[PDB]
């Protein structure tokens, strides 16, 4: 039976509590960058203009 066994509960809960933190921290660190500026693209993000920049005389 061994009545005095409350110290094992503290050591087992302690490691289990910290271990959870490592899993959350591990994903939290990698999580950064995935959303931090995904890539930012805008090929069709400019004004349209299918005309010559300048003309020689008229055209």
What is the C-alpha to C-alpha distance for residues 57 and 59, in angstroms, rounded to an integer?
6
Domain ranges of the chain: 7-36
CA dihedral 11, 12, 18, 22 (to 10 degrees): 140
Secondary structure (DSSP) of 3-18 = S--HHHHHHHHHHHHH
Q: State residue 57 phi and psi, 5-degree precision.
A: -140, -45
Structure tokens belonging to residue 16: 């289990």
């Amino acid at each position: 039976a061994h009545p005095p066994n409350e110290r094992t509960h503290l050591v087992i809960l302690g490691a289990i509590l910290l271990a959870l933190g490592v899993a959350l921290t591990f994903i939290f660190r990698l999580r950064k960058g995935r959303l931090l500026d995904v890539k930012k693209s805008g090929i069709q993000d400019t004004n349209s203009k299918k005309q010559s920049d300048t003309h020689l005389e008229e055209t």
